[PDB]
């Protein structure tokens, strides 16, 4: 089997660092992408940003100046951070994950299993 | 994801499978303008050292800029440069260079459309008129020439530093410069144009995770100096079809094992290189040149690709199949040489030539009979023929051996055509048709000889 | 980027009647690489993360249940559930990953 | 000015016309000369990182005349390197170095004659061995070694530079290198240098115009690094014809347009590549590489031109006048290809492949039939077949189509030769006469079975 | 020593002599390693402009290990690296990189034996690593963050710059580099490597002698970026066999004399180019690109020769012999063509064309006949064929014109063959007596119109 | 019809900088080359350097160190300076113009309308 586990505070003062840390068990991260969707309660899921099989990253336009994910393929771990949190991007964050270069990749398949994040002081 | 390479000694020909390719099918053209400055007057008098040699880098500037010009004056500096040239032509149109500045003002990046009615971004690499204008140029305006910080010196080194690798490398060039370099266009640069590309996601991963075969694949063309703005077109490449199934056949000549000199007649599939699925039919790329290799992914360039119908596949497997016509050559020299494929080798041993297959710790392990064999790329790390050694390569994965009655045995050495460099198998088949009936007109002589 | 416009909101319904939800994309969603089209159908459980129910809006994920299959081309998909249950109250979202990633409303069940 | 290409369909040809060319006929040699210090010893005692810095910089200046010394043992390193390896031997006897040293001791630029009998200029581009002595060389005599200023270190550097990235380009490319860098000749005193030649203004004024293409042909022969004198060859080019005119010939496939295959042959004049006018004859040059195109003004080099009679100018109007015996090639592959000519584009459809035209707001514009077919270059921009894509150049000029009944036509397949390379229009007309007394024999062999 | 050139005018072929050689038969790799530092982190809080400027050399550090990481990323990056890719794959391996990384603590070279079972010695070039940690680091840890003076910031560019220089070749080469830059392994570290490696002390005396070549032939395979440490394959060339004799041979053109064209038949031997002893038999090289050639040794390399037996030599002096069966063209077209030859050179002159030998100072001095005919390197400086010139090079040793009847007369045209890319004597003999054998039955049937 | 105008100063002190400017109407200076011939009084013609089409230059030998001709095409403008004048250089300036590479068209068939330059304090 695979499975996702999420580590981090999720309580965080207004306009400050948040950092997760999502360590990866069942596969290798030299091959699954990792992606990063964020549901705010009550509303659906927003995507913010990706991070491929070769290190490089795609954000969020919206984040892209705040939003940082990086990847470490040694110990299977993948990391991000966001700055400048403000009281709007209280959420639930899944560092869910990715296939190939193909649709048959199951999508967003294996999800974690969601860290609460409440933005407040 | 698996590479099983399949040798078939009915051809003896090596044919991969498994491959994941990605054919280039556009390209897309991003305006890298340099903010420079139009300073040519020196006023401040100062004999300083550290002044002569802020002086001297104004002066390379300043030789730079000609250079430019110069190159501007070589502008327009297929399928290549065009839409370079077009997007050079249209910034020498009134006002275009003034949108693209007015545009880039606010951010270092932006997407402008242009009076051709192509929108393309802009990216402003280096923003020199700034650096200039606000810190060198006022201490070269007052007559004092005042530099008591020789850091900047350098620090406008380093400024200037790019630029003159941008001219230098366009110098020799004549303003097309490939590869591009990490000074036309910076790595970081380039990962973050690709996310701002117009594309799939599929796009950006694929050329996100291999980003050197697309500086390898870059064009970088000489635009314009003009109204205090350089800008060249980075031309990048553009993957419509990605992780298609795409397989390389490797062929080596098959001659008769014939001890007597004179009768080898060799015959060499030439539909040799790199065959790749998209919108239903074979890209083929005859030259090894076009199509990079990574570790499974066979990027190409359809720039000189053919388009062919599926069934040429079945002519891999299958060499007198209806549906497919493959292509083949008939010589006569009959020279013992090797192939190292994925998988394995190739060896073509004939006449007196001693071939041999060899181990880093067994030492030689194998000896080669005549006639065209294949040897597994485990356990076998060299051979040598003759007096030449080919390594064999020690690439993972699984290797088939198909028993296969050589297609040469079959045609007669007699009547075998000689040097044809590109044939077919209908083809081959109508000239041995010509050539028997040439034979049977002959024996229609001796009959009417014999009666008459 | 692609909108997605899911309806209806809500759709309340009773055990063992049929649910049908429509999706439309903003453009189309088909691929001219591998002649596929890029959405996919997601089922959330209150309290539970999203489960990957259908991509291509036709290929179930594997251990799902055969009630949901739904259909579509172009730019109008349907998610069809043949037997609700009364455990399959859920939120149901579609979504599209060929331009960028984003997602619909939220197709709301609720049994009676 | 105006070019005029005249595309006929009888050939399916497409020639370029109105280009003023500018032959290149033979070369001048420069003796570029840098000023060295014969320095090897230290005296200097510092450990100040300063110091470290300008006894690193000396070691890497040592270390590059030691490479220097090196390609020099490589030394002597058609008409390519002869000038230079002269006036590298002649460098090597007594005395000639000497006498360049003691003439440009006033002077950056000087014509010196040699014992060969030949005068050339002498460049003394770079003063290094003033710099070293009067400035570095007191700083390492004195016991005290205090290197003054920070600037004298970076102006040592920067001089240095130039030196050393002339060894690093000479021994990756083992003393000779081309194109001539800015670092083996800057552009300024190139420009500097074309003034002294002895030519005429024409060729001024010519070289001035162009200094790209005089970089592409140029060359820069290492010779001889002795008696503080790093001396190399550069040997830059001299146009004896200016304003010549030069015509581009492209050609394609021309096929039969039947369905069936085995019976398309292909016919596709092998003369194809540029043709000047000199001295009342033609200089044809086949390949491509070595004619640059500039702005209608097309520059050439005449070591791999073929001199030619002028009648083979009726040959691009006429193929089967009698003057010139144009050449072909006859092959039987009717692959659908396009080549991209100057004011459009020739494309060749044949079989069952696709070949479209198109402009980028009107979309798809036009569908090709069988044979060879012209396109300009206005109101359409791109032409896709099968499954590649290719451009038309964005020229302006006047283009002119002429109907033409294809040559394929009057060529009976039966009889039409195959595989054929460079052929010509009376070598393919009796071998097909042969082939007919082939069949005219014949027809006395049932004439045979006839008559007995 | 003496070059002994002999131009058969038979086939009017040169033949140089007295050659020198130093073949290339094997490859050692030497595992060339960078020390790197693993720093991520600033925490400097300085905004002077020397800290800004260390700040940015540190980034350009760090982009140029992000860069290596991806080229790690397109390893593994046909015996040129087959050898060299297999110690990537090696230092892959758990413990493979930390058992170099301690032996070479004490010792900047070390011989490391690896898992393979192969020991390979390992050159540390550049330790980073110990002046990033020592000097620049302890400044970055502190708060204050004071560069002692620019002349730190200096260094540290100087420093930086050779792996800045070697991540661009790398990035632009996609890893695989050469000829081996300056950059990849300075000239004294590579004759240190030389001395170190394991070879016959001829091997040392011939590779210390000419480095140039070495380079040339070297290579540069990127293996690996991990765990502080940045390790290439430098694998240079590795010369089995030094001072055999070889010889090269230069052929021209030989075709009628009959000024009515289309009766020209000619023949040119196409087994020109480059021969040298080895065990006993010849490696021949078909192409003189890789026989690089000193003054009098000419270096080669076998990864693309061919073995022959001995007895090919007697076919230079005797193309008749039953011992070997020599390779020649027959071909149609007679340009008239020149060939530059070490001591002179071979001038093919047929129809209309004109062909004059000329001396610097005496002028025009002697008009070609038809025919190929030799003229040697002194008395003679230049030779003007049409439009087109080329030299003679002024090389010193004798030279011997031989009489020679030309073997073309030997041959009928009528029955002649036309464009063989490689034929053989026996081969044009064989067809010869097919067509006397098809012209004797056609005989035949003229006489049975007779007979009855 | 085609012209030049010549202006700036002819009248300046001897061993200073003396400048004009000839401003071309009725053609392109990207292809008409422009000379600038000298006449002192009682004395034919001598030649003062030229500027190509390109913008390269090629000075006469003798004024090669302190001749200087520039020109630019946007505004189709010729500017000449010399440096040391001396009263040896009193004389009649013309910005007479060129024509091709192939010589077949008015070598210097337009000339200015001439400017006096007397040299003296």
């Known amino acids: 089997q695979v499975q996702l586990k999420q580590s981090g505070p999720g309580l965080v003062a207004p306009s400050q660092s948040l950092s997760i840390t999502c360590?990866?068990?069942?596969?290798?991260?030299?091959?699954?992408?990792?992606?990063?969707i964020r549901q705010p309660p009550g509303k659906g899921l927003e995507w913010?940003?990706?991070?491929?099989?070769?290190?490089?990253?795609?954000?969020?336009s919206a984040f892209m100046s705040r939003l940082s994910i990086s990847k470490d393929n040694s110990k299977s771990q993948v990391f991000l951070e966001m700055n400048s949190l403000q009281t709007d991007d209280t959420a639930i964050?899944?560092?869910?994950?990715?296939?190939?270069?193909?649709?048959?990749?199951?999508?967003?398949?294996?999800?974690?299993?969601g860290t609460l994040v409440t933005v407040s002081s | 994801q698996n590479i099983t390479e399949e040798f078939y000694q009915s051809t003896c020909s090596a044919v991969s499978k498994g491959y994941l390719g990605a054919l280039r099918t556009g390209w897309y053209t991003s305006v890298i303008t340099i903010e420079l400055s139009n300073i040519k007057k020196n006023k401040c008098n100062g004999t300083d050292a550290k002044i002569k040699l802020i002086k001297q880098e104004l002066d390379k500037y300043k030789n730079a800029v000609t250079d430019l010009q110069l190159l501007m004056q070589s502008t327009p500096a297929g399928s290549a440069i065009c839409s370079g040239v077009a997007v050079c032509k249209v910034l020498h149109l009134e006002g275009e260079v003034n949108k693209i500045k007015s545009a880039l003002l606010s951010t270092n990046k932006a997407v402008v459309s242009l009076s051709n009615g192509v929108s393309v971004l802009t990216f402003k690499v280096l923003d020199l008129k700034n650096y200039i204008d606000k810190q060198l140029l006022p201490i070269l305006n007052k007559q004092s020439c005042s530099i008591p910080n020789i850091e900047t010196v350098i620090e406008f080194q380093q400024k200037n530093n790019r630029l003159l690798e941008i001219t230098r490398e366009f110098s020799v060039n004549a303003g097309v410069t490939t590869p591009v370099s990490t000074y036309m266009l910076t790595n970081s640069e380039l990962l973050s144009l690709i996310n701002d590309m117009p594309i799939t996601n599929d796009q950006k991963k694929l050329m996100s995770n291999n980003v050197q075969i697309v500086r390898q694949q870059s064009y970088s063309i000489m635009c314009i100096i003009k109204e205090e703005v350089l800008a060249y077109v980075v031309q990048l490449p553009l993957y419509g079809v990605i992780d298609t199934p795409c397989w390389k056949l490797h062929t080596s000549p098959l001659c008769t094992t014939n001890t007597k000199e004179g009768s080898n007649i060799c015959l060499t599939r030439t539909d040799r290189g790199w065959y790749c699925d998209n919108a239903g039919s074979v890209s083929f790329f005859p030259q090894a040149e076009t199509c990079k290799v990574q570790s499974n992914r066979v990027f190409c360039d359809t720039m000189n690709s053919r388009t062919l119908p599926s069934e040429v596949n079945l002519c891999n497997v299958d060499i007198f199949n209806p549906k497919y016509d493959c292509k083949i050559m008939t010589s006569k020299t009959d020279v013992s040489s090797s192939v190292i494929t994925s998988l394995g080798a190739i060896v073509s041993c004939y006449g007196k030539t001693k071939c041999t297959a060899s181990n880093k710790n067994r030492g030689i392990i194998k000896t080669f009979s005549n006639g065209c064999d294949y040897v597994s790329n485990k356990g076998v790390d060299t051979v040598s023929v003759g007096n030449t050694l080919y390594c064999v390569n020690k690439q993972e994965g699984q290797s088939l051996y198909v028993k296969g009655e050589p297609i040469i045995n079959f045609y007669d050495p007699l009547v075998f055509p000689s040097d044809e460099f590109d044939a077919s198998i209908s083809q081959v088949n109508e000239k041995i048709n010509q050539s028997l009936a040439f034979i049977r007109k002959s024996d229609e002589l001796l009959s009417a000889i014999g009666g008459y | 980027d692609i909108v997605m416009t899911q309806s209806p909101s809500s759709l309340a319904v009773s055990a063992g009647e049929k649910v049908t939800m429509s999706c439309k994309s903003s453009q189309s969603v088909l691929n001219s690489s591998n002649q596929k089209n890029y959405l996919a159908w997601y089922q959330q459980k209150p309290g539970q993360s999203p489960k990957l129910l259908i991509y291509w809006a036709s290929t179930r994920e594997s251990g799902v249940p055969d009630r949901f299959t739904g259909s579509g081309s172009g730019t109008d998909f349907t998610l069809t559930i043949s037997s609700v249950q009364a455990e399959d109250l859920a939120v149901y979202y579609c979504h599209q990953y060929l331009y960028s990633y984003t997602f619909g409303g939220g197709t709301r069940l609720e049994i009676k | 000015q105006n070019i005029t290409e005249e595309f006929y369909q009888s050939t399916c040809s497409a020639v370029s016309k109105g280009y003023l060319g500018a032959l290149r006929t033979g070369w001048y040699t420069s003796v570029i000369t840098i000023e060295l210090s014969n320095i090897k010893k230290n005296k200097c005692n510092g450990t100040d990182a300063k110091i470290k810095l300008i006894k690193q910089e000396l070691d890497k200046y040592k270390n590059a005349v030691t490479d220097l010394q090196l390609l020099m043992q490589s030394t002597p390193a058609g008409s390519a390197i002869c000038s230079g390896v002269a006036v590298c031997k002649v460098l090597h006897l007594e005395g000639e170095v000497n006498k360049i040293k003691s003439a440009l001791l006033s002077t950056n630029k000087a014509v010196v004659s040699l014992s060969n009998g030949v005068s050339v200029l002498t460049f003394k581009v770079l003063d290094l061995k003033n710099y070293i002595d009067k400035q570095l060389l007191p700083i390492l005599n004195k016991q005290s070694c205090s290197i003054p200023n920070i600037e004298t270190v970076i102006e040592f550097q920067q001089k240095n530079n130039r030196l050393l990235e002339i060894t690093r380009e000479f021994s990756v490319n083992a003393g000779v290198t081309t194109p001539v860098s800015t670092y083996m000749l800057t552009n300024s005193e190139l420009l500097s240098l074309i003034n002294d030649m002895p030519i005429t203004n024409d060729q001024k004024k010519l070289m001035s115009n162009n200094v790209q293409i005089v970089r592409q042909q140029s060359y820069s022969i290492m010779c001889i690094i002795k008696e503080e004198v790093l001396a190399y060859v550069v040997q830059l080019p001299l146009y004896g014809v200016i304003d010549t005119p030069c015509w581009k010939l492209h050609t394609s496939p021309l096929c039969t347009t039947n369905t069936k295959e085995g019976s398309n042959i292909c016919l596709t004049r092998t003369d194809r590549g540029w043709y000047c006018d000199n001295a009342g004859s033609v200089s044809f040059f086949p390949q491509a590489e070595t004619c640059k195109v500039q702005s209608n003004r097309v520059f050439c080099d005449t070591m791999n031109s073929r001199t030619l009679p002028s009648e083979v100018n009726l040959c691009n109007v006429d193929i089967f006048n009698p003057k010139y015996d144009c050449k072909i090639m006859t092959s039987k592959t009717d692959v659908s290809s396009s080549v991209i000519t100057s004011l459009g584009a020739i494309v060749s459809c044949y079989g069952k492949t696709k070949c479209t035209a198109s402009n980028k707001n009107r979309g798809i514009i036009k569908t090709f039939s069988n044979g060879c077919d012209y396109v300009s270059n206005k109101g359409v921009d791109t032409v896709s077949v099968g499954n590649t894509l290719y451009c038309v150049n964005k020229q302006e000029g006047q283009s002119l189509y002429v109907k033409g009944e294809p040559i394929i036509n009057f060529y009976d397949p039966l009889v039409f030769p195959s595989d054929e390379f460079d052929a010509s229009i009376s070598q393919v007309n009796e071998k097909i006469n042969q082939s007919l007394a082939f069949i005219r024999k014949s027809d006395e062999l049932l004439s045979a079975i006839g008559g007995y | 020593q003496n070059i002994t050139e002999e131009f058969y005018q038979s086939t009017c072929s040169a033949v140089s002599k007295g050659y020198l050689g130093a073949l290339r038969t094997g490859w050692y790799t030497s595992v060339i390693t960078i020390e790197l530092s693993n720093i991520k982190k600033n925490k400097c809080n300085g905004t002077d402009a020397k800290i800004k400027l260390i700040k940015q050399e540190l980034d350009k550090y760090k982009n140029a290990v992000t860069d290596l990481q991806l080229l790690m990323q397109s390893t593994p990056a046909g015996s040129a690296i087959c050898s060299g890719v297999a110690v990537c794959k090696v230092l892959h391996l758990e413990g493979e990189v930390n058992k170099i990384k301690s032996a070479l603590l004490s010792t900047n070279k070390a011989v490391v034996s690896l898992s393979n079972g192969v020991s390979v010695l390992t050159f540390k070039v550049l330790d980073l690593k110990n002046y990033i940690d020592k000097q620049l680091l302890p400044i970055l840890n502190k708060q204050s963050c004071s560069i002692p003076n620019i002349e730190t910031v200096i260094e540290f560019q100087q420093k930086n710059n050779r792996l800045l220089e070697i991540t661009r070749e790398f990035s632009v080469n996609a890893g695989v580099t050469t000829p081996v830059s300056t950059y990849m392994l300075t000239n004294s570290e590579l004759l240190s490597l030389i001395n170190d490696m394991p070879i016959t002390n001829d091997q040392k005396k011939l590779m210390s002698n000419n480095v140039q070549i070495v380079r040339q032939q070297s290579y540069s395979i990127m293996c690996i970026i991990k765990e502080e440490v940045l390790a290439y394959v430098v694998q240079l060339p590795l010369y089995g066999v030094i001072d055999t004799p070889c010889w090269k041979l230069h052929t021209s053109p030989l075709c009628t004399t009959n000024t009515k064209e289309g009766s020209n038949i000619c023949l040119t031997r196409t087994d020109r180019g480059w021969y040298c002893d080895n065990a006993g038999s010849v490696s021949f090289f078909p192409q003189a690109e890789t026989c690089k050639v000193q003054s009098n040794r000419v270096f080669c390399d076998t990864m693309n020769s061919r073995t022959l037996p001995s007895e090919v030599n007697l076919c230079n002096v005797d193309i008749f012999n039953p011992k070997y069966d020599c390779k020649i063209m027959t071909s149609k077209t007679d340009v008239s063509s020149s060939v530059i030859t070490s001591l002179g050179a071979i001038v093919s002159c047929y129809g209309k064309t004109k062909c004059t030998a000329s001396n610097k100072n005496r002028g025009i001095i002697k008009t070609f006949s038809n025919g190929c005919d030799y003229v040697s390197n002194k008395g003679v400086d230049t030779v003007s064929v049409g439009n087109t010139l080329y030299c003679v090079n002024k090389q010193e040793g004798q030279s011997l014109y031989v009489k020679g009847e030309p073997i073309i007369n030997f041959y009928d045209p009528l029955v002649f063959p036309s464009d063989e890319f490689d034929a053989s004597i026996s081969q044009v003999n064989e067809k010869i007596n097919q067509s006397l054998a098809f012209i004797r039955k056609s005989d035949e049937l003229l006489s049975a119109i007779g007979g009855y | 019809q085609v012209q030049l105008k010549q202006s700036g100063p002819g009248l300046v002190a001897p061993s200073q900088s003396l400048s004009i400017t000839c401003t071309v109407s009725?053609?392109?200076?990207?292809?008409?080359?422009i000379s600038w011939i000298r006449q002192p009084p009682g004395k034919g013609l001598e030649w003062l350097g030229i500027?190509?089409?390109?913008?390269?230059?090629y000075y006469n030998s003798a004024f090669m160190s302190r001749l200087s001709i520039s020109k630019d095409n946007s505004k189709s403008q010729v500017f000449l300076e010399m440096n040391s004048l001396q009263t040896d250089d009193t004389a009649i300036y013309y910005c007479?113009?060129?024509?091709?590479?192939?010589?077949?068209?008015?070598?210097?068939?337009?000339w200015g309308q001439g400017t006096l330059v007397t040299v003296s304090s």
């Open positions: 007479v113009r060129a024509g091709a590479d192939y010589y077949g068209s008015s070598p210097l068939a337009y």
């Open positions: 009725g053609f392109s200076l990207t292809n008409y080359d």
């Open positions: 500027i190509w089409t390109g913008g390269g230059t």
